[PDB]
From a paper:
CP consists of a highly conserved globular core flanked by two large extended regions with a high frequency of structural disorder. The C-terminal high intrinsic disorder region (C-IDR) is partially conserved and packaged in the lumen of the virion, supported by the helical ssRNA scaffold.
To prevent encapsidation of ssRNA, we further truncated the C-terminus, excluding 60 C-terminal residues (CPΔC60) containing both the C-IDR and the α8-helix, which is placed opposite to the RNA-binding loop and forms part of the RNA-binding cleft. This indeed led to formation of RNA-free filaments. Interestingly, the filaments had monomorphic helical architecture, VLPΔC60:h, with unique helical parameters. Because we found that 19 C-terminal residues of this construct, including those of the α7-helix, were not defined by cryo-EM density, we prepared another deletion mutant, CPΔC79, excluding these residues. The disrupted RNA-binding cleft in CPΔC60/CPΔC79 thus lost the ability to bind RNA, and consequently the RNA-binding loop S125-G130 adopted the conformation found in the RNA-free filaments VLPh and in VLPr. On the other hand, the fold of the N-IDR in CPΔC60/CPΔC79 resembled that found in RNA-encapsidating filaments, consistent with the CP-CP distances along the VLPΔC79:h filament being closer to VLPh+RNA than to VLPh. Thus, disruption of the RNA-binding cleft by large truncation of the C-terminal part of CP prevents RNA binding and also leads to the formation of monomorphic VLPs.
Author numbering:
A (entry chain Ar), B (entry chain As), D (entry chain Aq), E (entry chain Aa): 42 to 188
C (entry chain Ad): 70 to 188
Write the structure that this text describes.
């Protein structure tokens, strides 16, 4: 009478075993549902990102409220330009009609494992930023996304 | 009258012979029916898997009940990412909204003949895990299965 | 010449010579250091292991035979080595038994091997 | 019926023989499983290390509880700098914001066969120390490890 | 009718001749089938090995039953380390958690033509010893085999 429903884990599926016991905790494996970007190696670890963030803030010698504005310009600068730039150089943020100079050594250095992975944390914001700008001008960046 | 039934081994089939005697024990060959994954070289040997399992547990210096939870995260981390990662790196397991860091040297090393073969022991569980997650989100991993 | 009617597998170079096969057989038995009655059971597992896997495996490795729910380890160096001219030709002696073994197993499960036959 | 199991030592393997008798005690050879770092010549012998340890402690004329703190600084000083320094010099340990001077003659001398081999006893601790520091700053030493 | 069988030595093969007579005793040449390791110069002669064996035993001044245990440790010490070590040094054998010191001068000296050739007598046992240890740990020696 009852229409059967199949389980996710059957009693026929071979679990990995070591010394006669299973090596996976299935009571918690089904519950364990992380996000695909939190456990991907294409993104720098949060410990590495916070290591980079306060290392750049201390190198630039700026406060905690001035720091987010720098990241706004650094994200946009990383949209037009690449994530493998010259370490002995500068990156520019606009203050209206006046360019503002920042050394590129504190940024390329202290970014582990790679600036690409550190900059990949801005990918969701970067995509939204381009689409907003693309709605008012033929904006297309030379070097892909911030990733 | 009787409808004949053909034997599996006829008296006309050439057995391998050495010094006049057959080299195969046919009395036990028909009974011998192993599983295709237990005698395949695409999977690491159980002796090698147990060698890897206690070598990782001892390197991480954790108990026997905490160990299965690590393998739950390591399997999922091996779904999104590959089985040939940087040995000088870390792999991440989520504890809710906080990443947990584990060295990737005890994992890539001590896995013989290859991490792929060691990780291939999770293939049946890995396929079920994706299909369960794929039923609630467009989940697709960059690097295939755990194999 | 008219009387001379050999079998097509006894004079084919896709199969190792009987002198070479017996050279391989006692060379593997002596290397494994096992008796004459235990030896055929090893060949039963080695044939099946050569159905799922290939005949060009890593010489620095092992091949597995099942003892129920326990794997049994055998070095693959005495097998790949001492097999002349090639393990393929040495293993080709099991082709008739290998075909029958698969068809028997295929009658109870969707059994299909990655690496063809034992040949 | 029985699936054979191969012995580690077969009755066909040529043992080294002198005057008709074997030169290896096989009853104890299988049991004899030392650690690869206890019988390696890249590490100074324990007799040599203890010879160096009390020779440095006596030369510095310090107690037994003050001595371990000196080795903490000497290990770190041997991470940034090499293990072949000038014997007519000093090595520095920090006491906060004040450098502390120690002669380098009692260290380079009395270390047999080489300071490198004597300092190689700290390799496991040295690797852990760098990885701990590398998690909070881009720490990389000029002269490799303490080895 | 008879299918011919070819001889190993035909009546057309040029034998080496001196003064009209052959220089090889073919009646015994076919029977003469030595082992490839007994007549190879990569291995020290048995006369040289026994010369080395009792020369080391007499130098160490130990009995005939204590001697095989020393060779067990010396073989393993020659797996991790090389066969060209400093003659003015020591080699270590483990007694559990206590190193045991042996001079390396009686070993490097009295070994003719070379310690390598003298130590090559342990090659078969050395290969088996590593494979046994490699089944329980990622054991790999710096300096190849005992050869």
């Amino acid at each position: 009478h009852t229409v059967p429903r199949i389980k996710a884990i059957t009693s026929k599926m071979r679990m990995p075993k070591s010394k006669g016991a299973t090596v996976l905790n299935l009571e918690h494996l089904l519950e364990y549902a992380p996000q695909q970007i939190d456990i991907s190696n294409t993104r720098a670890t949060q410990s590495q990102f916070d290591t980079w963030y306060e290392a750049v803030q201390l190198a630039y010698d700026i406060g905690e409220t001035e720091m987010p504005t720098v990241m706004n310009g650094l994200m946009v600068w990383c949209i037009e330009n690449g994530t493998s730039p010259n370490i002995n150089g500068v990156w520019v943020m606009m203050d209206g009609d006046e360019q503002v100079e920042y050394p590129l050594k504190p940024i390329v250095e202290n970014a582990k494992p790679t600036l690409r992975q550190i900059m990949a944390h801005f990918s969701d914001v970067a995509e939204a930023y381009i689409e907003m700008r693309n709605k008012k001008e033929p904006y297309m960046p030379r070097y892909g996304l911030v990733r």
